[PDB]
């Protein structure tokens, strides 16, 4: 029938000479079945019956890709939910669809003396809220948008960056993998999962010595006449402390989603379970982060938002020492006197009998 299939040629055709050259060197018992299968309908539920321009390739509102309803007058295109009001993709009114801006233009007949007229009349009518008059008149000339924070708000926090499609990123995003486009190409079986080669993953890149795991205090480099003794060292993304995969019970190398964080950072969110929430702020840089050094040391509380020196409270190791010891001592003695009073009350209640 002459149409090529997966094999390269028509189905009613043997192999070509090129394939057979570069690919060469130079009664049964399931006849049965329609005799042994007998249907099963033993189940419990058997009772159940059962200007010739073209529009843009992106949404004018969210600036992303998809299936667009387009406008004929102007090259704008919108998603269906990205309109005002959103349109049902099935029940689409055919006829001439225009956007808000072109509809405003055709309504005013592209005459702005009439814009003067209607806006003056509008501001005369909306006498109750005269401050919001002109504002309330401009909203009707704009095609819809989506919300994006003003840039004077995003730039108060410097660890915050707008992602690709206007998404949130906060320094815990590892990065997209650029030479992992180079990874689809790769070096042959020299994988990005870090297998089969760990002689130079146990060696400090810059200094030259070995990376020693924090928990076991060894760099088990193994010996590559016996590769079953290596132990897959990995370093934290924040403090660069090295850990074995068998010590932090992880079984993976974090490569794509976020940065891996050592067990040696305190929290960033608590859930006290008593339940209450954070004791950790955001990093308000721009050199508006003001510090305070309290004049009293052994009682100041102020937050879980301290900074340790040799609003952010500046505190030193001595005050932390004293506060820890004080808290545990007084909690100790208070719980002991509570048990004392309970047990003595118990004895006078029991001898009362």
């Amino acid at each position: 029938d002459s149409k090529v299939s997966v094999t390269g040629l028509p189905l009613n055709k043997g192999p070509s000479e090129k394939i057979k050259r570069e690919s060469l060197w130079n009664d049964l018992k399931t006849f049965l079945t329609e005799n042994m299968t007998e249907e099963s309908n033993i189940r419990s539920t058997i009772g159940w019956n059962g200007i010739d321009f073209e529009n843009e390739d992106f949404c004018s509102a969210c600036n992303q890709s998809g299936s667009f309803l387009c406008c004929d007058t102007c090259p704008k295109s919108f998603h269906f939910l990205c309109l005002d009001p959103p349109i049902d993709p099935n029940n689409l009114p055919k006829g001439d669809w225009h956007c808000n801006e072109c509809k405003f233009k055709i309504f005013i007949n592209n005459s702005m003396a009439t814009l003067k007229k209607i806006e003056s009349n509008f501001i005369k009518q909306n006498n109750n809220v005269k401050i919001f008059a002109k504002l309330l008149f401009n909203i009707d000339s704009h095609n819809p948008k989506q919300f994006q924070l003003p840039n004077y708000i995003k730039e108060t926090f410097p660890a915050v960056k707008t992602g690709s499609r206007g998404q949130y990123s906060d320094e815990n995003d590892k990065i997209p993998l650029t030479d992992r486009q180079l990874f689809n190409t790769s070096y042959g079986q020299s994988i990005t999962k870090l297998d089969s080669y760990n002689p130079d993953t146990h060696i400090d890149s810059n200094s030259g010595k070995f990376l020693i795991c924090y928990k076991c205090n060894q760099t088990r480099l193994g010996s590559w006449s016996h590769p079953e003794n290596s132990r897959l060292i990995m370093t934290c993304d924040y403090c660069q402390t090295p850990w074995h995969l068998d010590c932090v019970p992880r079984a993976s190398f974090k490569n794509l989603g976020s940065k891996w964080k050592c067990p040696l950072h305190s929290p960033t969110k608590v859930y006290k379970k008593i339940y209450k929430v954070w004791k950790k702020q955001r990093l308000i840089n721009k050199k508006n982060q003001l510090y305070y050094e309290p004049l009293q040391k052994i009682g100041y509380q102020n937050n879980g938002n301290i900074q340790i020196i040799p609003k952010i409270t500046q505190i030193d190791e001595n005050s932390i020492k004293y506060d820890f010891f004080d808290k545990i001592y007084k909690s100790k003695m208070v719980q002991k006197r509570k048990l004392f009073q309970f047990q003595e009350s118990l004895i006078d209640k029991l001898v009362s009998n």
């Binding site: 040696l264 950072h265 305190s266 340790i308 932390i320 820890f324």
Partner: peptide, 30 residues
């Protein structure tokens, strides 16, 4: 008497300064 030795032992055994700082931050949170 011995708690001074405890805090000095912790400072020695941690080995680093950033790790000791994070340790002190944990202690402060508690």
């Amino acid at each position: 008497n011995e708690e001074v030795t405890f805090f000095e032992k912790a400072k020695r055994y941690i080995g680093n300064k950033h790790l000791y700082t994070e340790f002190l931050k944990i202690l402060n949170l508690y």
